[PDB]
Write a protein that binds this ligand. Structure first.
Ligand SMILES: O=C(Nc1cnccc1C(=O)N1CCCC1)c1nc(C2CC2)ccc1Nc1cncnc1
Ligand SMILES: [Mg+2]
Ligand SMILES: [Zn+2]
Length: 313
């Protein structure tokens, strides 16, 4: 109970910053996450014995894929931890509990393939879940791990607190379906400009939390340039693997996914930062001013990709 986690000084300090990289030492990532839960939620809110067993079962059910892996889970959790700490009073004790857990579990058992690829392959998961295929599977896996003996970190919540937090986690994980992001941000944009945004409206919170999940999920675009550049390699390793599999099914893949069209990556990133990342963090900064560092960082990286095209690296 009096068992704080501490981090080495540089981590202790840098972990509060949005642009923090969790490092190449796998074995520290659980302590990092526990540290985040304790400082964000309390040393009280989860029985340590149970959290650790949950964290290690979640690690076990991420696969050894280049991008959608255990490292991504904790990177995404970290970003949500930074947002919650810089917007202390805007969130309930329960939202803080469920959101860090939602981020850790949001890509559980990802196989390194898009919802589209499942649909054209005709994967059983596409039979069982027609939209947000991987995302409904990710939530399904979360509930599975929560139902293993000695794994229910939510044991101490009232029945109604319990349905609230599992409903936050479910909406949170579904929101990470980037197909849903576009409309969800358009509505938040419209609601913020016309000033009808109201954080006591539950349907309004849901949208705001959805955008936070999109923000946290893309936070590799908000790191120092060298982290962003090297993460971009990982994401393209999966994209091209998927393109190979599309060709294997007799389907010309979109260029993003074609390893022959590697030349066109820097323009691809421009499109992405402009169509997705920049608008995402803009609307998020508008709703939550303290998140501006994510927007500043995203812009630097957009500018870094512009330098790539102009042959300046
Ligand atoms: O780069 C990404 N996507 C694209 C690249 N090239 C072309 C088109 C796209 C694209 O998805 N769209 C949709 C509509 C706009 C174009 C990208 N995608 C995603 C998910 C959407 C899967 C996550 C991160 C990403 N980048 C990235 C991540 N971490 C470090 N550095 C860079
Ligand atoms: Mg995902
Ligand atoms: Zn993700």
């Amino acid at each position: 109970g009096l068992m704080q986690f501490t981090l080495p000084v540089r981590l202790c300090k840098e972990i509060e910053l949005f642009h923090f990289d969790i490092g190449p030492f796998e074995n520290m990532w659980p302590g990092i996450f526990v540290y985040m839960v304790h400082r964000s939620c309390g040393t009280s809110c989860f029985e340590l014995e149970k959290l650790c067993r949950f964290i290690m079962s979640v690690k076990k059910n991420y696969r050894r894929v280049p991008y959608h892996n255990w490292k991504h889970a904790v990177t995404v959790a970290h970003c949500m931890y930074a947002i919650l700490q810089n917007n202390h009073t805007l969130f309930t004790d329960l939202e803080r509990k469920g959101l860090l857990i939602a981020c850790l579990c949001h890509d559980l058992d990802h196989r390194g393939f898009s919802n589209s690829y499942l649909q054209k392959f005709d994967h059983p998961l596409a039979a069982l879940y027609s939209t947000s295929t991987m995302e409904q599977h990710h939530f399904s896996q979360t509930v599975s791990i929560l139902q293993l003996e000695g794994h229910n970190i939510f044991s101490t919540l009232s029945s109604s607190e319990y349905e609230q937090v599992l409903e936050i986690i479910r909406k949170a994980i579904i929101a990470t379906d980037l197909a849903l992001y576009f409309g969800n941000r358009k509505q938040l944009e419209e609601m913020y400009q016309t000033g009808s945004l109201n954080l006591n409206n539950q349907s309004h919170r849901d949208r705001v939390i959805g955008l936070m999940m999109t923000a946290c999920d893309l936070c590799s675009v908000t790191k120092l340039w060298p982290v962003t550049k090297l993460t971009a390699n990982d994401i393209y390793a999966e994209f091209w693997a998927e393109g190979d599999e599309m060709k294997k099914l007799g389907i010309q893949p979109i260029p993003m996914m074609d390893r022959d069209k590697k030349d066109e990556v820097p323009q691809g990133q421009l499109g992405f930062y402009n169509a997705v990342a920049i608008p995402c963090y803009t609307t998020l900064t508008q709703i939550l001013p303290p998140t501006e560092p994510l927007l500043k960082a995203c812009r630097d990286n957009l500018s870094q990709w512009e330098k790539v095209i102009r042959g300046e690296e």
